[PDB]
């Protein structure tokens, strides 16, 4: 629920789109196992798709560590310091590919409720409304019932 969960506002990392787009994902770390059915999909991904992904995303450093593990994992570290760890346990090659592409396209900001679907640093161009907008002025600025 929203009330039992943190929230934030729609935002970028460093105005990521203004001058140039900078891929926020910077590091991927695939802990995979030589043996074990859990990491069969991870092994096939490393064999077939990891090189293509690496060359498609030259700005992301990809580490692949083959160690004995029961649940293969991918740790994504973003420029803003965020670290997101996702288990690829028993995931097919296509599932791992989609997950990795989602990580690459995603920013480091927390996946929590976003208060507004928009964010303007300059919401007003003609001047934010205030009670005296649309109110006519009076001669000598006389308030109502003023004698003079």
């Amino acid at each position: 629920t929203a009330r039992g969960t943190p929230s934030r506002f729609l935002a970028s990392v460093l105005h990521n789109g203004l001058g140039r787009y900078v891929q926020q994902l910077q590091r991927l770390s695939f802990s995979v196992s030589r043996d074990g059915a859990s990491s069969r999909g991870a092994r096939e991904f490393v064999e077939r798709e990891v090189i293509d992904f690496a060359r498609r995303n030259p700005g992301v450093v990809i580490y692949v560590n083959s160690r004995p593990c029961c649940v293969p994992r991918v740790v994504a570290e973003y420029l803003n310091g965020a670290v997101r760890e996702e288990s690829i346990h028993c995931k097919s090659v296509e599932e791992i590919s989609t997950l990795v592409q989602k990580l690459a396209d995603q920013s480091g900001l927390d996946v929590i409720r976003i208060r507004k679907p928009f964010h303007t640093d300059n919401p007003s161009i003609q001047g934010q409304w205030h009670p005296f907008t649309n109110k006519p002025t009076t001669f000598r600025g006389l308030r109502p019932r003023e004698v003079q």
């Binding site: 030589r34 074990g36 059915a37 069969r40 083959s66």
Partner: peptide
């Protein structure tokens, strides 16, 4: 294809 469950490196 089920034999692939034990495919290793």
């Amino acid at each position: 294809d089920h034999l692939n469950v034990t495919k290793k490196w």
